[PDB]
Design an enzyme around this catalytic site. Sequence first.
Site, short mmCIF file in Angstrom:
data_model
loop_
_atom_site.label_atom_id
_atom_site.label_comp_id
_atom_site.label_asym_id
_atom_site.label_seq_id
_atom_site.Cartn_x
_atom_site.Cartn_y
_atom_site.Cartn_z
N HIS A 1 3.60 6.47 2.77
CA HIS A 1 2.25 6.49 2.20
C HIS A 1 2.06 7.07 0.80
O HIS A 1 0.95 7.01 0.27
CB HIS A 1 1.26 7.16 3.17
CG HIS A 1 1.20 6.49 4.51
ND1 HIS A 1 0.73 5.21 4.67
CD2 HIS A 1 1.55 6.93 5.74
CE1 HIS A 1 0.79 4.88 5.95
NE2 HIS A 1 1.28 5.91 6.62
N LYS B 1 5.54 -4.48 9.07
CA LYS B 1 4.44 -3.55 9.34
C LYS B 1 3.16 -4.25 8.86
O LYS B 1 3.09 -4.68 7.71
CB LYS B 1 4.63 -2.20 8.66
CG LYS B 1 3.58 -1.16 9.09
CD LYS B 1 3.82 0.23 8.50
CE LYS B 1 2.75 1.22 9.01
NZ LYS B 1 2.80 2.54 8.33
N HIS C 1 0.13 11.45 9.23
CA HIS C 1 -0.37 10.10 9.58
C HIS C 1 -1.48 9.74 8.60
O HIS C 1 -2.29 10.59 8.22
CB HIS C 1 -0.87 10.10 11.04
CG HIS C 1 0.18 10.41 12.05
ND1 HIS C 1 1.34 9.68 12.17
CD2 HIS C 1 0.22 11.35 13.03
CE1 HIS C 1 2.07 10.18 13.15
NE2 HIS C 1 1.41 11.19 13.69
N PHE C 2 -1.49 8.48 8.15
CA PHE C 2 -2.62 7.98 7.36
C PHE C 2 -3.55 7.25 8.32
O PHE C 2 -3.15 6.26 8.93
CB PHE C 2 -2.12 7.01 6.28
CG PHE C 2 -3.18 6.63 5.29
CD1 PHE C 2 -3.28 7.29 4.07
CD2 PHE C 2 -4.11 5.63 5.60
CE1 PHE C 2 -4.29 6.94 3.17
CE2 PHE C 2 -5.10 5.28 4.69
CZ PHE C 2 -5.19 5.94 3.48
#
EC number: 4.6.1.18
Length: 124
Positions: free
Chosen positions: A12, A41, A119-120
């Site tokens: 990210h 993804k 985590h995004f």
Amino acid sequence: KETAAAKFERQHMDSSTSAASSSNYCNQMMKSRNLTKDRCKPVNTFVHESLADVQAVCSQKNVACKNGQTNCYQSYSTMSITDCRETGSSKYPNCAYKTTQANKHIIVACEGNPYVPVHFDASV
């Protein structure tokens, strides 16, 4: 071994470019960051701010995570981001992505000591 914090950085973070991001960007970046290894993804966001600024979000506005956990945080300021979204014609191993730049508030989940993004969750 890759820590959760390191995995977040790999998936990210892209402080090297300010925003721009060419039409090739997601195609190049999704591959180079190893997000097309096991499958394409489907959706992935890169943040073009300093690591320090993104880490700082863990002390900002506490919000509910999409999964219902309570450890998410929304940035007070907008941040420069690039969303990568898999095209309809994309077929593994030749993963294809639409590159879209935005300036939005990010929402990340934070864990650990030190308390850092792992985590995004969303942009808003």
